[PDB]
Each structure stands twice: as structure tokens, then as C-alpha cells.
């Protein structure tokens, strides 16, 4: 929350749709991290269809900037709620106000030139408390195309990968929901046909000695971009209408 405010932040928090605002006043029947169910007062209530106002909260999902947008309930079980009151906080909003960051203890003084120009010198207490930590949500895609050499397979059978590589994938070639990955990990196995490598003499000798069959298939599999690491919160499979959906899908 801002410790030093203005009094506008409340208005920004509410007017912007990031929060979840009560349609009608009443008592809270149910509070889940998923949803919030409110029992309406009669004076605000329409005669027909009785009612309760059910609010389905947005859960962890990809924002436009590749940040995370997630709503949290600010109310508890069986609480009075006025009409036009905040039922849930959006990202960067606290208790119905706008918190775009965090307030902290700050001291103005040169410290060993580590603050030199505009530079900022921050205690380990902050990085430990995980307060300035941020959750990014990235959307990666794997495209199965059609090449004149043949169609591309999403199959989990990938030329030249260890059992450790094919472990995080199911039988169908897609990564399990929830598996934490890093750079180099294969999210989706994809292989495209390229036949007749047309190798050279020494390579042919090598193959003659080691008796390896050079595959007619090339590895196009979508892998996590180098250096970035996180957890898988969802997977979607779009299929051309009429093509047989694989096992995973």
C-alpha cells in the first residue's frame, strides 16, 4: 500500500477493472480463492429469480506485458458488504487502494560510492523478504506445419534426446502442468521430416563403424528460451477442425 498517499489511489483502484467490485450489497455466503458468493439484501434484490451474486475471480494468467495478473479475495466468510465495495484485490491493489510498489525504510547518505550517480544500494533483507519479487507469465507456442517433405508430428518420440529429456513430457509430447522448467527444457516435442541427409565420406565411415541409422526426421521441438525459468500453469491445444486429436489434447 502506499504509506505516503494522495487519496486518488482508491479511485484508480476501483474505477480500473483490475479489482472486483460488488454489484449489490449483502452478506458473503462463500469465499474461495476461486470465487466469491454474496447473498443479496432484499431491498436491492429483484423480486424474481431470488438471487445471490456470484463472482468468478480471475486467476493466474498472462497480462499483455508478460507480467502476472491475479485476483485475491479481500473479504472473509460471512462478512457484511456494502453495495459498491471491493470484493477482491487485483494485482498491485491493496484493500481497495492502488499500490504500485512498496514503501521501505530509506536513508540518504553516500555509502562507499555504491550509490554513485542515481545508483541504489539495497539490503539483503529486501531480497530475502521477497517483496520486490515479481511473477511473469509468458506464452510460448509450438506450430505443427505442412512441408512438401511431409507433415510435422507433435509426437514424444524425438531423435537424439536422453530419458531425462523425454521424462518431463507425457506420451503425447507435451509437458505436464506444474513441472518447473529452465533453459533447454523441452516444453513440446515436435519433429519435421527432412529425408536423405546426403552425408560425406568420413561421416559415412563413421556410420559404417558405429552402425547408426541417421533419421529422416529433424527435431523442431519448442524449448524454453535460454536463461528463463519458471513453472507451467496451463497448456492449450488448437486443432484444425477434422484432424484427429492426439492423446494429450
Amino acid at each position: 500500500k502506499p504509506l505516503v498517499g494522495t487519496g486518488m489511489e482508491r479511485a484508480v483502484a476501483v474505477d480500473s477493472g483490475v479489482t472486483a467490485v460488488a454489484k449489490r450489497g449483502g452478506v458473503v455466503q462463500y469465499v474461495d480463492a476461486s470465487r466469491i458468493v454474496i447473498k443479496v439484501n432484499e431491498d436491492e434484490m429483484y423480486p424474481g429469480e431470488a438471487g445471490i451474486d456470484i463472482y468468478n475471480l480471475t486467476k493466474y494468467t498472462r497480462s499483455n506485458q508478460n507480467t502476472c495478473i491475479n485476483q485475491m479475495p479481500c473479504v472473509s466468510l460471512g462478512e457484511p458488504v456494502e453495495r459498491g465495495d471491493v470484493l477482491a484485490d487485483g494485482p498491485s491493489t491493496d484493500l481497495g487502494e492502488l499500490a504500485l510498489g512498496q514503501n521501505m525504510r530509506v536513508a540518504f547518505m553516500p555509502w562507499n560510492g555504491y550509490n554513485f550517480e542515481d545508483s541504489i544500494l539495497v539490503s539483503e533483507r529486501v531480497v530475502q523478504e521477497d517483496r520486490f519479487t515479481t511473477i511473469h507469465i509468458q506464452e510460448l507456442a509450438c506450430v505443427s506445419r505442412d512441408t512438401k517433405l511431409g507433415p510435422e508430428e507433435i509426437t514424444a518420440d524425438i531423435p537424439n534426446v536422453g530419458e531425462a529429456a523425454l521424462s518431463k513430457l507425457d506420451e503425447s509430447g507435451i509437458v505436464y502442468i506444474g513441472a518447473e522448467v529452465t533453459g533447454g527444457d523441452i516444453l513440446v516435442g515436435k519433429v519435421t521430416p527432412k529425408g536423405e541427409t546426403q552425408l560425406t565420406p568420413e561421416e559415412k565411415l563413421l556410420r559404417a563403424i558405429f552402425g547408426e541409422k541417421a533419421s529422416d526426421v529433424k527435431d523442431s521441438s519448442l524449448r524454453v528460451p535460454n536463461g528463463v525459468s519458471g513453472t507451467v500453469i496451463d497448456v492449450q491445444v488448437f486443432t484444425r477442425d477434422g484432424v484427429e486429436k492426439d492423446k494429450r489434447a
Partner: protein, 224 residues
């Protein structure tokens, strides 16, 4: 050259206390007090939760039906669960509960070396009549700050995808403040006192702390 020794160790709250060192020579109250501040805040034994495996959960970013806390917030709440052991360097606690109401730190399954210093400490709430959360809360012991990130180098089949690593909080110490007040033993020219007022989660006794602190301090002098 009179060597110092401690004196009354006054417990105020389960949280913090003021310890004291009586026989201090010229300027040595600072020479000691600051070094001791340093070693106290930094290097200390502590036991914090590391790996948590919950009921139906693949990852910390989902929600469990029947509890208003997101898995992320629950893990964060667990990181702040203070415990203490005796004869084990890792102990795996068992948490079970159901029914509508708060799930506190006392709802776990007590073990031989388990001591819950804050039984009222909140894990997460329970919003529905029949909903039940079971978790194996793996709590080990160590030093300093080990983030969940640096934890995977070793790896070696961490495959139980339901296992969520959290950052290591290990440390008893919250705040250390030393004061040097002139202390007059009944007869001497001039001497000072070291009042070391520390702050803890209650998982370490003051004398234990200050002792192992001084211990490591001298242990670095081993050069000669």
C-alpha cells in the same frame, strides 16, 4: 587485562531479550558489541521449512478448491512457520485438517523433536464444510539464506512434481542492537557494560546464541 564474562540474561518476551557482559575494558565494548552484532545477524543455526508437498497440487500457482488462500500464499505462510528440533537435521512434518475454520500451526502431527513456538501461526483458512488439506511439510536445518533457485544444481530426480521447494529462511535472529553504558563494578578505575539486546523467533536461547557467536568469532582467529 581483565577478560569479560556475562551477567544477568533478562528474558522479556518469547520473542526477544537483553543479554549483558559486565567486565569490559577501554573501548572493548564496541570492539566486541559490533563484531558480535555481525556474527549474530549473519551466521546462526536455524530450522525453516524447505520442501512442501500438498494434496492435489502440481505447482504453487494454482488454487485448491475449499481454501481461500492461493498455494503461493500458503507456501509463503509456511516459510514463516517457526519450529525447532533436537536430534534431527531434517524432519518431515505431517499436516492434516478439514472442516470450516482456520488451519493453524498446531494442527500438524507432533513428532519427537518437533517444537511449535507459535501454535497460532496461520497456515491458511478453510472455507467449506467438507474440504480437507493434507501436506507433508519437509523442514530441515541450516544457515544463512538459501533461495529456492540456487537449490537446484544437484537436482537428481526431484521428479515428485507435487513437491514445491521454497526459499530457505534459516536464522533465529531478527534484530540485534548493542549498547555500551559505563558500568561501575564496585572498585575499578573505568569500565563499561555491553548490553546486547537481540530479537529472535524464540527458536534459539540467548546464551546459546551469544555463545556460538563468540565461538565462531574465536574460531576465525585459528590462523595463529
Amino acid at each position: 587485562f581483565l577478560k569479560p564474562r556475562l551477567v544477568d540474561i533478562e528474558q522479556v518476551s518469547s520473542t526477544h531479550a537483553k543479554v549483558t557482559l559486565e567486565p569490559l575494558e577501554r573501548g572493548f565494548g564496541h570492539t566486541l558489541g559490533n563484531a558480535l552484532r555481525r556474527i549474530l545477524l549473519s551466521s546462526m543455526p536455524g530450522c525453516a521449512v524447505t520442501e512442501v508437498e500438498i494434496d492435489g497440487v502440481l505447482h504453487e500457482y494454482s488454487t485448491k478448491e475449499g481454501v481461500q488462500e492461493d498455494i503461493l500464499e500458503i507456501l509463503l505462510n509456511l516459510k514463516g512457520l517457526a519450529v525447532r528440533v533436537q536430534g534431527k537435521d531434517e524432519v518431515i512434518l505431517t499436516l492434516n485438517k478439514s472442516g470450516i475454520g482456520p488451519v493453524t500451526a498446531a494442527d500438524i502431527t507432533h513428532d519427537g523433536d518437533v517444537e511449535i513456538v507459535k501454535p497460532q501461526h496461520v497456515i491458511c483458512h478453510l472455507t467449506d464444510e467438507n474440504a480437507s488439506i493434507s501436506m507433508r511439510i519437509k523442514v530441515q536445518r541450516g544457515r544463512g539464506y538459501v533461495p529456492a533457485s540456487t537449490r537446484i544444481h544437484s537436482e537428481e530426480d526431484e521428479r515428485p512434481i507435487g513437491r514445491l521447494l521454497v526459499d530457505a529462511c534459516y536464522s533465529p535472529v531478527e534484530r540485534i542492537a548493542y549498547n555500551v553504558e559505563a558500568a561501575r563494578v564496585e572498585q575499578r578505575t573505568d569500565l563499561d557494560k555491553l548490553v546486547i539486546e537481540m530479537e529472535t523467533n524464540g527458536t534459539i536461547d540467548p546464551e546459546e546464541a551469544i555463545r556460538r557467536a563468540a565461538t565462531i568469532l574465536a574460531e576465525q582467529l585459528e590462523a595463529f
